[PDB]
Amino acid sequence: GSQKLVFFAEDVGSNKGAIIGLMVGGVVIATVIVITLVMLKKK
């Protein structure tokens, strides 16, 4: 299966990476904010 990288590359799939960044972003961001808020208070 040659010419599979270039094609998919130039085409850039279809907003695929967006999904990953969306989920990974919400989790990573949220997680950080949680640790900060929790570690900040510490009761």
Side-chain angles (χ1 to χ4, degrees):
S2 182
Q3 302 296 74
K4 56 172 276 167
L5 210 306
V6 183
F7 196 63
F8 189 94
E10 233 270 315
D11 202 330
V12 196
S14 198
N15 199 259
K16 278 283 278 176
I19 304 302
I20 302 103
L22 211 298
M23 289 283 225
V24 178
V27 189
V28 170
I29 294 171
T31 300
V32 179
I33 299 295
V34 178
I35 301 297
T36 51
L37 184 50
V38 177
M39 81 181 237
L40 177 134
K41 303 168 71 276
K42 276 274 155 287
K43 65 195 287 294

